[PDB]
Each structure stands twice: as C-alpha cells, then as structure tokens.
Write a protein that binds this ligand. Sequence first.
Ligand SMILES: CN(c1ccc(C(O)(C(F)(F)F)C(F)(F)F)cc1)S(=O)(=O)c1ccccc1
Ligand SMILES: CN(c1ccc(C(O)(C(F)(F)F)C(F)(F)F)cc1)S(=O)(=O)c1ccccc1
Ligand SMILES: [Ca+2]
Ligand SMILES: [Ca+2]
Ligand SMILES: [Ca+2]
Ligand SMILES: [Ca+2]
Ligand SMILES: [Ca+2]
Ligand SMILES: [Ca+2]
Ligand SMILES: [Ca+2]
Lengths: 229, 235, 12, 12
Amino acid sequence: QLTAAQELMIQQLVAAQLQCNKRPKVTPWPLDARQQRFAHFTELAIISVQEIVDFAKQVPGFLQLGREDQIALLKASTIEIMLLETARRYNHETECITFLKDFTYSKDDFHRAGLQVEFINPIFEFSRAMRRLGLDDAEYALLIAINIFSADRPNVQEPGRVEALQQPYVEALLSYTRIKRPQDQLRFPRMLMKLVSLRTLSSVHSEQVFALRLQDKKLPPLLSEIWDV
Amino acid sequence: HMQLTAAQELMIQQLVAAQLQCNKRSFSKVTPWPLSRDARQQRFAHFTELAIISVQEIVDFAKQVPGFLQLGREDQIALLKASTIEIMLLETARRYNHETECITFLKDFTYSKDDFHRAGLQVEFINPIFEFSRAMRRLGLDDAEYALLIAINIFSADRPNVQEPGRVEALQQPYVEALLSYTRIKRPQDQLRFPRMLMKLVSLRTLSSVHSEQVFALRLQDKKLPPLLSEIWDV
Amino acid sequence: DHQLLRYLLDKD
Amino acid sequence: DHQLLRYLLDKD
Ligand SMILES: CN(c1ccc(C(O)(C(F)(F)F)C(F)(F)F)cc1)S(=O)(=O)c1ccccc1
Ligand SMILES: CN(c1ccc(C(O)(C(F)(F)F)C(F)(F)F)cc1)S(=O)(=O)c1ccccc1
Ligand SMILES: [Ca+2]
Ligand SMILES: [Ca+2]
Ligand SMILES: [Ca+2]
Ligand SMILES: [Ca+2]
Ligand SMILES: [Ca+2]
Ligand SMILES: [Ca+2]
Ligand SMILES: [Ca+2]
C-alpha cells in the first residue's frame, strides 16, 4: 500500500537514474605510468559528477531551491553519492568495482593510481557492507534523493525548505521497506545509518585529497573547486 | 503499539536514572574565567577543563549502559574515542538557550559565540556547534530519547579500530528498537521522529570531523590539549 | 566559484 | 597507550 503518487514518483526516480547510468572517452588505463592512472581516475570522477548533477535536476523539488543551495547540496553530496554508486557496482566474487560498461578495478588498481589504504580499504569495507543490506533499484534511488536533501550541509540558505523536500522521500523509503520486507523493521534504520558512514567517508576522502597535495598529485581545476582546501 | 514491554520500559528507566546519577557526581574546580596573552591562554584552559569534566561524565555513563563493559576493553576504548565528542555536542545542545543564543556550561554562567571566540576557537567550528544546538532544540527530545540516542551512538559498529563489529551492532539493536517503540507510542502522529533523530547521528559525524580540524588548527597555534583530551583526540 | 556545478546546472 | 582513559574505565 504505497499511494498512487509514491509508486509513480519512485518509478520516475529509477527511470531518471537508469537514463543517467546509460547517458564517453577517458585517458586509457596504462599497460608517468603512475600519473596516467591518477588522471584516469580524476576523469572518472569528473564524469560521475556530471551524471549526479544530471540526476539531481530530475529529482522533484530540487529546482525549487535557489541556485546557491543547489550548489551547496551538490558540493556536499557528490562524493557521498559517488561512493553509493561505487558500492552498488561492487562484484563480491571478483572483489572488483566495474565503472562505465566494462572497466574493472581491484583494491590494488586503486593502489596503483596513487590512493592510500586509509582511504582505499574503507571504500571496500563500505562496498561489502552495502551488499549485505541488499538494496534494490528503488531503495538506492530514494536513499540518494534523501542524501541530496540534507538541511545540514554547509552554507544552506533555506534549511527548512530542504528538510521539507527530504521528508516525502523518507516517507516513501519507510513504507517501501515496511512492505518489501515487513519482516525486518530494523532495515530502515540500518539504511539511514549508512548515511552516517558516508559522512565519515566524505571526510576520509578529503584527507586523501590533501594527501595528494604533497605527493605531487593534483586534480583538474573543476574538481579542485569542489574538493580542495 | 499503545504500550512498551516491561523489558523496554525497564531498559529506559535505568539509562535515564544512570544519566541523572552521572550528572550528580558531576556536580561534585577549574581555572576561573578571565574578566592580554595570558588571558587568551586561560580562557582556553577554562574550556579544556570543562571538556575534561564532560569526558569523565561520559565515560562514567557509558560504564552504566548495560553491555558496554561486556565488550573487549580495546573496543571500549575505540567506541569512546569516537563517541565522546558527539555525545558532548548532544549535551551542549541540551544547555543551549535559543532566545539569546548562548550555552550555559555551569549554573548561571552563559557562553556566547564571542566567548567561544575569545578562547581561541575558530568560527568555522563555533557556528556549526550553535547551528546544531539550535536544530536539536527544534526536535525537543525528552530524557528517555536523549538517553537512548546516546546509547545508540556509543554502540556504532562503524567506528575505527573496532575489533568485534558484530558484537557492537548486536548491542545496539535493543536500544534502537526501544527508541523506535518509544516514539511511536509517545508521538503516534509524527511518523518521522525516529528518522529525524537518527539523522542527527549523521550531523554529529560531520561535526566530529570539524572538531578534529579545530584540534589540528590548535597545534599550528601552539595550543596543546591536556593529557586526557590528548589521549582521546590527538594523532 | 563552483564553475563545474554552475555550468552543469545551466547546461540546457 | 590511553593510560588515563584505561584508569577511568577501571575505577571501582
Ligand atoms: C569514490 N572513489 C574516488 C573518488 C574520488 C577520488 C579523487 O578525488 C581523489 F583520489 F583525489 F581523492 C580523484 F581525484 F581521483 F577523483 C578517488 C576515488 S571511486 O574510485 O569509487 C570513483 C571514481 C570515479 C567515479 C566514481 C567513483
Ligand atoms: C563541543 N564544544 C567543544 C568540544 C571540544 C573542544 C576542544 O577539544 C578543542 F577546542 F580543542 F577543540 C577542547 F580542547 F577545548 F576541549 C572545544 C569545544 S563545546 O564548546 O560545546 C563544550 C566545551 C566544554 C565542555 C562541553 C562542551
Ligand atoms: Ca547517480
Ligand atoms: Ca582489473
Ligand atoms: Ca552524559
Ligand atoms: Ca544567530
Ligand atoms: Ca562566562
Ligand atoms: Ca550571540
Ligand atoms: Ca558575553
């Protein structure tokens, strides 16, 4: 028993998000060698940032925000939404993440690009754990919508409005989980707890970025504006 | 859906009573507040000494949460090191006056943003503290909900250097369930109260990261933490 | 500031 | 490691 709207709105979210997963050329992976790998990643990041914004514009409500809050919400949730997408494309038998249509990367490939274990491991711990919860399309879609409308992001001008926008997505997730598995009531909490983990991941990601500042690696100006100190 | 089980009702009263207790033993003396480069360092000492008092109360209360000491001593360390700053921020919110925007740390002494600033703290930390304290008051938790939320925050399998995540996540369940049943009963018409409360755990986690940066920014400024705090927050 | 987001938002 | 903390936990 989801309302007629909820069921539809959820289909439109999943549609939107699929259309974004399907809707490009990057610096091919090496076979200097270290730097070509790093660049390769920063270009994957640039591409996902683009899908994420493309998705956001289609999340109902999002464009009711002023432009600066749109900016503020996306600046904060970008890396967090990324890690969700990574987690979602993690193959457990192979232990590799598959990125566009074909590409596969191991906990070691990440090491070759220049990332550090302090950041690399927790990403895989999170991908593993995200697999235990076993989310379907609808849940990832709502969870992402919920992450976007976080009234507590730095520099948000209309916190009240953002929370009111988040509210319906929380309701829909709550019901959905009460029906898909009326068995486990703790499934809803446990999903929200992942949002908590994402904040810590975002923080670890920033350290990873600061790290590269010394290890003579830097990101394109466009990503730099989103993630630098 | 109209009434708590006696096991849950009991669990809640023990936490509430434990918290009340640890806060009384907290009543039973720090560097005074300066009414100068020494004054600058003294205000900081003042804050750090209030912080030491808080940590002690927090450890004391965590020891009284059922199941906490049944954990590996090492995981006890791990959970507290992560927890302490978040639980402090919850208790700071609990002392926040929304009308004049200050926090009462003792009895009749009130601290404002400028007071925090005169103790060497930076606005990028200060404002997020007041922001969160403000948001918390909108939520208006009672004794039972505060006590449960803190129990739940302590038992986060999420934390760094936790050796037995599964034990930790197993302890947290009954407290999560209790909070869930408690809010449905006391506030049946607000279906989102439980979710909003968990959402606060998300905020606290960012706030923890902001505090670390404050701690780091104090190093580059010649201000070091006293032994207990250092033990907890330095790297 | 945040030209990547501003550009992507204006795009279309 | 974590000496003063290890104390607080041990009291009583
Ligand atoms: C979350 N991960 C990640 C994100 C950003 C960076 C970086 O920000 C840095 F290494 F600097 F931290 C950079 F620069 F590579 F993009 C590095 C790693 S990821 O590998 O799973 C991923 C990459 C692309 C797209 C989607 C997910
Ligand atoms: C959360 N805040 C805080 C916590 C820790 C510190 C510090 O850790 C540092 F400034 F270094 F960041 C220190 F050292 F003062 F305690 C500074 C401020 S508080 O002002 O609300 C508060 C102070 C005292 C007691 C309870 C709460
Ligand atoms: Ca997406
Ligand atoms: Ca490979
Ligand atoms: Ca306490
Ligand atoms: Ca104000
Ligand atoms: Ca004062
Ligand atoms: Ca003020
Ligand atoms: Ca004053």
